[PDB]
Amino acid sequence: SEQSICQARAAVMVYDDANKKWVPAGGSTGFSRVHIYHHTGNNTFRVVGRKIQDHQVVINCAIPKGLKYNQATQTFHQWRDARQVYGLNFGSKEDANVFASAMMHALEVL
Ligand SMILES: CC[C@@H]1C=C[C@H]2CCN(C(=O)[C@@H]3CC[C@H]4C=C[C@]5(CCCN5C(=O)[C@H](Cc5ccccc5Cl)NC(C)=O)C(=O)N43)[C@@H]2C(=O)N1CC(=O)OC
C-alpha cells in the first residue's frame, strides 16, 4: 500500500564513477515522472520514476533516515547510497521545489 506524496518531472541520472560522467538512468535519455511513495505501515519512503514515453521504471530507491540531499542548483538535485549517486535534472524550478519539499518532509518524519 503506497501513497504518492509528490510528482515531479525530471531526467533521472546516475553517476558512472569510472568515466566521471552522468548517464541516463535505465539507459534511456529523456524525462520521467518521479514520485516519492510513502508506505505508511512502516513509515518508509521510496523514489520511483517512470519514463514519460514508455513507462519504464528507471529509479526505485529507498530514502533512508539521515540522507544528505544536495540541492546543487535550482534545477539539479542529487544524493548517494552505498552503491550509486543519483541526480535529478528537473524540468523546471517548480518541479525541483515540489520534489525537494516532499524529500525534506520525508527526512524530517523518518
Ligand atoms: C547532468 C547535467 C548536470 C547538471 C548540473 C550540474 C550541477 C553540477 N554538476 C555536477 O555534475 C557536479 C559538478 C562537480 C561534479 C563533481 C562531483 C559530482 C558528481 C559525483 C557526485 N558529485 C558531487 O558533487 C557530490 C554531491 C553530493 C554532495 C553531498 C551529498 C550527496 C552528493 Cl551526491 N559530492 C560527493 C563528494 O559525492 C557532481 O555532482 N558534480 C552537474 C553537471 O555538471 N551537469 C552537467 C554535466 O555533467 O555535463 C557534462
For 30-66, the DSSP string reads S-EEEEEEEEGGGTEEEEEEEETTT--EEEEEE--TT
Q: How was this structure determined?
A: X-ray
99: left (phi over 0), alpha (psi -120 to 50) or beta: alpha
Distance, in Å, from the CA atom of 83 to the CA atom of 55, rounded to the nearest integer, reads 24
Domain count, the chain: 1
Ligand 1 neighbours (beta carbon < 6 A): 13, 15, 22, 68, 70, 72-73, 76, 78-80, 85, 89
Which CATH number goes with the domain that contains 57? 2.30.29.30
Determine the distance separating the centroid of ligand 1 and the alpha carbon of 90, expressed in angstroms: 14
Distance, in Å, from the CA atom of 31 to the CA atom of 91, rounded to the nearest integer, reads 8
Q: How far is CA 109 from CA 52, 65, 66, in A?
A: 30, 9, 11
What letter represents residue 86's amino acid?
Y
Give the number of the atom of ligand 1 that is nearest the alpha carbon of residue 72: 7
- What is the grid cell recorded at 59? 529509479
- What is the grid cell recorded at 104? 525534506
CA angle 36-40-43, nearest 5°? 80
Task: Using the structure block, give the residue that is written with the C-alpha cell 523514489.
Answer: 47
Q: Own/partner pairs for 31-34, CB < 8 Å, 24+ apart?
A: 31/91, 32/58, 32/59, 33/7, 33/8, 33/9, 34/7, 34/8, 34/9, 34/10, 34/59, 34/88, 34/99
SS3 state at 67: coil
Structural domain span for residue 80: 1-110
Q: How far is CA 5 from CA 40, 76, 85, in A?
A: 11, 20, 23
What's phi and psi for 101, nearest 5 deg? -55, -50
Best residue among 17, 20, 22, 81 to mutate for probing ligand 1's pocket (most ligand atoms within 8 Å of CB) is 22
